Every structure is written in C-alpha cells, then in structure tokens.
Amino acid sequence: ASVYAWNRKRISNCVADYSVLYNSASFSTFKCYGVSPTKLNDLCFTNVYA
Amino acid sequence: EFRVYSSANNCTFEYVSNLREFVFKNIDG
Ligand SMILES: *[C@@H]1O[C@H](CO)[C@@H](O)[C@H](O)[C@H]1NC(C)=O
Structure with missing residues (x-):
C-alpha cells in the first residue's frame, strides 16, 4: 500500500517465530524500541499489528 | 434461514x- 493509505493487519492466536525473521540476513534496517530483539521469543503479548 | 447478522466490525x-x-x-477472560 501507499504511504498515505498504509495497510494494517492484526495477528493473534498463534505461535510466532521472531528468530527466523532475525536471522533472515536479508533486511537492511532492524530497530526495536524498548524490547530486546534477541529476547523477543521469551515474551508473550496479546496481539500484534503489522 | 439465517437472518440475524448484518454487520462486520473489528x-x-x-x-x-x-x-x-x-x-x-x-x-478471567
Ligand atoms: C475494535 O476493538 C479494538 C479493541 O480496543 C478497538 O481499539 C478498535 O477501535 C475497535 N474498532 C472499531 C472500528 O471500533
């Protein structure tokens, strides 16, 4: 989607795998504010928004 | 016959x- 019409998708009721995204070795930027990205797997929230 | 539901929100x-x-x-939920 365009920047003025940024799309949203909620995700819940599933098992995430952040390490695979971490070790994709293809992204250019990766900044996580307030959380340890390597310790993301050892955390549990209610829902995420992409 | 299904005539109850007429919406789609969150x-x-x-x-x-x-x-x-x-x-x-x-x-507790
Ligand atoms: C759907 O529920 C969430 C839960 O708080 C709320 O934030 C959101 O505004 C709701 N959507 C609409 C269209 O009311």
Missing part, C-alpha cells in the same frame, strides 16, 4: 470445529 478470536446438559462459566 473481529477477534474465531473457533471452528436422550437429553443434553451444558454449563457456561466466564472467568
């Missing part, structure tokens, strides 16, 4: 799968 969890007895509790 959704959340969705699950699909003599006499009869049932009990329904609701605690």
Whole structure:
C-alpha cells in the first residue's frame, strides 16, 4: 500500500517465530524500541499489528 | 434461514470445529 493509505493487519492466536525473521540476513534496517530483539521469543503479548 | 447478522466490525478470536446438559462459566477472560 501507499504511504498515505498504509495497510494494517492484526495477528493473534498463534505461535510466532521472531528468530527466523532475525536471522533472515536479508533486511537492511532492524530497530526495536524498548524490547530486546534477541529476547523477543521469551515474551508473550496479546496481539500484534503489522 | 439465517437472518440475524448484518454487520462486520473489528473481529477477534474465531473457533471452528436422550437429553443434553451444558454449563457456561466466564472467568478471567
Ligand atoms: C475494535 O476493538 C479494538 C479493541 O480496543 C478497538 O481499539 C478498535 O477501535 C475497535 N474498532 C472499531 C472500528 O471500533
């Protein structure tokens, strides 16, 4: 989607795998504010928004 | 005939799968 019409998708009721995204070795930027990205797997929230 | 539901807002969890007895509790979500 365009920047003025940024799309949203909620995700819940599933098992995430952040390490695979971490070790994709293809992204250019990766900044996580307030959380340890390597310790993301050892955390549990209610829902995420992409 | 299904004439009850006439909307689609924000959704959340969705699950699909003599006499009869049932009990329904609701605690801590
Ligand atoms: C759907 O529920 C969430 C939960 O708080 C709320 O933030 C959101 O505004 C709701 N959507 C609409 C269209 O009301």
